[PDB]
Each structure stands twice: as structure tokens, then as C-alpha cells.
From a paper:
[name], the etiological agent of TB, possesses a cholesterol catabolic pathway implicated in pathogenesis. The overall fold of [name] is that of a two-domain type I extradiol dioxygenase, with the structure most closely resembling that of BphC (rmsd of 1.16 Å for the 275 common Cα atoms).
Crystal structures of [name] were obtained in its substrate-free form and in complex with DHSA at resolutions of 2.0 and 2.2 Å, respectively. Crystallographic four-fold symmetry of the two molecules in the asymmetric unit indicates the enzyme is octameric, like BphC. The metal-ligand distances and ligand-metal-ligand angles are within experimental error of those observed in BphC. The two most significant structural differences between [name] and BphC appear to be associated with the larger substrate-binding pocket of the former (550 Å3 in [name] versus 420 Å3 in BphC, as calculated by VOIDOO).
Residue numbers in the entry:
A (entry chain A), B (entry chain B): 2 to 297
């Protein structure tokens, strides 16, 4: 523990657009009990996976990371204490809002905020998408998120050495792409695992207005993906990449712009990894085929 | 009885375009022993599946239909004689050229030419696509071909009642689509099977320049399809339909224009049918998702 991506909390300038998009494009289900004009989007037994709160910005607020139990959370505390990373225990009100038994809050060096928790409540009535797809979560958690970092070496240190994620994959970026002179060194996009899902987390050393590069959610079948593409097309959702399969996690997916300005990857067939045999290597292409990121 | 589609012979106005497309887009392999300036494209142990001969038009010449043995071919002779359909035995030169033991030649009432044969020679050196895909033939044969017909009822009688194909699916057209009065009767696109492949043959009662609406070839995996689409886009092959999944045969495929001006559907995951269970019904949509023919 940490074992998986639990939830994502984001701020939004357009709550109506997010509601229509989560319901009619993503085919998520609305959760009950929210604020004060906030939106809970459900994919499974979790009370909420995507929480959208109204605000003046379109940005990531926090990612919530689930541990197996009190001991698995304490292990994260002990790592943080060894590094000297400041953290706070959740207030009574934060525990009640998130519906978790314990949680700590802290930030990585680039100052992306984390909530690490255990003992979430679940809701048990069947979550049924009107479009007939089922999301793939379980032991792989919510999906995976790719976030901006200020410094890839620093991110590698905090996520692997401090937090204990595994390095799953790495891809180099030419120095020009990251605002470095043509004469100096490439920078690194690194993918991190906490469970069999190839990656739950990755860091792009390039800035974004939201802090999010992409959020991937996974469904069981290619037909689920293709039907989703059709719904997005009908609703004039702006496209970011055509259908394709990734090299590193073998995900078959397309990418589309959300109302928050970052991409959602809507995929299937994500590769599962066993840490006992996985060899961390450098991948040299994004995709095996498709995924034309010029489409936007 | 006829067991599968064996080969397709077409005439072409641009042999160089076909050789490049066959090799670099379809990833078929060139056969040997082709006559003067003809092109043999191979998918498997057949000496050729797609035969392209020089000519003044881009047009279907004949479809070759494989039977299991001499008795299977005689059963077709018997059916033709019962109907009063004229047919000719292949000459010595024709048997040698097609590399078959026996073959009869005749046409349907719309004038489409059939060559029904048994005892093909095979070639045994491995056929290796440079792109790494394997075609799906075997008991399913070469693929399927959708052809023009002048009269759907007469085609239904000839293919089902006379030749013994099974009716596999039907799709209705608005009377006005076939230039009838808008309060006239619908016409019918009918799909015919001779093996587990959902259909080997279908008839659109609408005219085409070549006689061909589409030729489908099948590969093992979605990645093979996705890779082919990238090759085709790179080579500026005209797209006819986006990636999608058909309703009737569940083929996951895209459509593209060949050098002959007709479409090839390049697909995977074709549905298998058992005649003991199969119910012949009317489908009311082309696709579950995708297959936007508006791109062409
Ligand atoms: Fe992803
Ligand atoms: Fe087809």
C-alpha cells in the first residue's frame, strides 16, 4: 500500500458541461450526497471516482490513493517521515466528506497534492451505465493519471524511492520539446505502478493549465470504446488522438478533450504486470498503430 | 456443394498501382508463374487468391468457388441441369492456368461469371507477410465478396434455390434508393453462406462500375487491421469507411478504395455460423459502431 488510484478531485468552471459529459459521453453514473453544486461520477462500488467541484479554475485539486488497511497507510507515513515530507492528518470533516477511515494529505516536490487513505465506504446497489459498458477497476483501481512535473529526476525520487511505486516504463523527450536548447540532454516521461495495471501514474516534465495530461478510464471490450467514440463524435467532443494501441501498456483507446481542458483516454485491454518478472525498459514510440495526436 | 470462395479474378487498367497496393498496403505476397504482365496475390497455400490481369476496364472477371471433391462438383452440375442453366467444362488450357482438376463455367441471371472447381494445386513454402499478419482462410475460404445484382429475387432463387447457398442475413433498401416510386416496394441486400464464415457472398441490387461493392479479407488480430490502416493512410489510399464493427458478421474492419475503384474491407473477428442453429433474419443497421461511410 499504496495499492491503487482511488479517486480524483478536480475544480471546474462549467458544472453543466461536466455533468452532460460524464453522463452522456463517459456513461458514468451520478452519485448522491454531494455539496453545494458539486458532481460525483461513479464507475463502480466507490461512492465516487471522479469528483468535480465548482470553482474559478479548471484544475486537479487532489488525487486519492487507496491502501489495503491501517498498516499500509502507516507504512506510507513512515516513508514520508524518513524523507521529511510534511503531511497532515485529515480533519473529522475531510474524513466524512471522502468517506474514509483514515487519510493523510501532502504534496509532491512539484506540489501536486496527494490524499492517501484506507477503509473507504462502498455503495452496493448496482451501478449500471445506460450504454451497457462496465468499467475495469477492482485491484487495478480507478484507472491511471498522467500529470505534469517540474523535474523528472525529482519526481522519480519521490514516487519510487520515497513512496515505493515501481518504475514500469520510461520514454525520452527531445530537449526542444521541453524548452531546453537543442544541444542539451533529453528529458524523461516515466510511468509508475502500484498494482498489476501497467501504470497508475505518470509524470510529463511539461506544463499543463490543469496539471493533468490525461486521465484514462478502462472498459471491458473494444465495442465499449467504439460506442463511446460514436457518442463523443455525435456530441462534437473535440478529439485529441484517433483509435490506437499503446506500446507500453497495450491499451486500445482514443483520446478526447474533457470540459476541463485535459484529455480523457477511454480504453480497453490494458496489460497487467507482475513485478517479480517485469523489466523496466525504455519505450521509443507512443503507439504500435493509430493514436494520431495531430487530430486536434 | 460449393464449400468456399477460392479466388477472385479481376481486370485492371493500372497493374503498377495494384502490385504496389497488394504488396505494401494489403501485405499479400506475389505468386509465381503468372502469364504476361498478370499479378498473382497470395494469402496462404493457394497459388493465388487475387488474380489481377491487364485490361481496358476495372471489373470483376469471375469468382472461383471451391468444392470438396469431384462428387461435390457433380452435385452443382446436377443443380444447374435441373434449372436449365448453361455451363461449360473448362478447356485443358483453363484447367492448367487455374491449376484445378475440374472446373465448370457459367453465369448467374445478372451475368456475373462463376468458375466452380475442385482439386486445386497448393504451394507449400511458407507465405510470410512482411507486416507480420496472417490471413484467416482455411475452411472459411478467401473472404467474402459483395457484388451488384439486377434483381434481388432472381439472385435469391439462383444462389439459394439452385446453387444451395444458405440465406444468412437480409437488409432492406428504400424503394427510392433503387429508383422506384417512394411508395413502391423495398429492395433487398442479401447475404449468403456456404461455410462457417457468416457470408462468402452478398448481392446489392444497385449498380457498380466494376461489378464489385466490396471485397473483404480477414486477418487474425485487431492490431493487424490497425497496422494496415496506418500503411494505407501513409500511402494516401482513399478511405471509404472509418473503423467499426458490423452488425451481421461482427467484423471489426475499415474500408478503403482499391486501384480498381471498389472497396476492400480489411477485417478481423468475423462471426462463425452453424447452419443447425442459424436463424435467417433482417438486420436494420450496417454497424454497431463506427464504419462512417461519409468519409468516402
Ligand atoms: Fe494512458
Ligand atoms: Fe464485408
Amino acid at each position: 500500500s499504496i495499492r491503487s488510484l482511488g479517486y480524483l478531485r478536480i475544480e471546474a468552471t462549467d458544472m453543466a458541461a461536466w455533468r452532460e459529459y460524464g453522463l452522456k459521453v463517459l456513461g458514468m453514473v451520478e452519485g448522491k450526497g454531494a455539496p453545494e453544486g458539486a458532481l460525483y461520477l461513479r464507475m463502480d462500488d466507490f461512492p465516487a471516482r471522479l469528483v468535480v467541484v465548482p470553482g474559478e479554475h479548471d484544475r486537479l485539486l487532489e488525487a486519492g490513493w487507496e491502501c489495503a488497511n491501517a498498516e499500509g497507510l502507516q507504512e506510507i507515513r513512515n516513508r514520508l517521515d524518513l524523507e521529511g515530507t510534511p503531511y497532515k492528518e485529515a480533519t473529522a470533516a475531510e474524513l466524512a466528506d471522502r468517506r474514509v477511515d483514515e487519510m493523510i494529505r501532502f504534496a509532491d516536490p512539484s506540489g501536486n497534492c496527494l490524499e492517501v487513505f484506507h477503509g473507504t465506504a462502498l455503495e452496493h446497489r448496482r451501478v449500471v451505465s445506460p450504454y451497457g459498458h462496465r468499467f475495469v477497476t477492482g485491484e487495478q483501481g480507478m484507472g491511471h493519471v498522467v500529470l505534469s512535473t517540474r523535474d523528472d529526476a525529482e519526481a522519480l525520487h519521490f514516487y519510487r524511492d520515497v513512496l515505493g511505486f515501481r518504475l514500469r516504463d520510461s520514454m525520452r523527450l527531445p530537449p526542444q520539446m521541453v524548452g531546453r536548447p537543442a544541444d542539451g540532454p533529453p528529458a524523461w516521461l516515466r510511468f509508475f505502478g502500484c498494482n498489476p495495471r501497467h501504470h497508475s501514474l505518470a509524470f510529463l516534465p511539461m506544463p499543463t493549465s490543469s496539471g493533468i495530461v490525461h486521465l484514462m478510464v478502462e472498459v471491458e471490450q473494444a465495442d465499449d470504446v467504439g460506442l463511446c467514440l460514436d457518442r463523443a463524435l455525435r456530441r462534437k467532443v473535440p478529439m485529441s488522438a484517433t483509435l490506437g494501441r499503446h506500446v507500453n501498456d497495450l491499451m486500445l483507446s482514443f483520446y478526447m478533450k474533457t470540459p476541463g481542458g485535459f484529455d480523457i483516454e477511454f480504453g480497453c485491454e490494458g496489460r497487467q504486470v507482475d513485478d517479480r518478472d517485469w523489466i523496466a525498459r525504455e519505450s521509443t514510440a507512443v503507439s504500435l498503430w493509430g493514436h494520431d495526436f495531430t487530430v486536434g
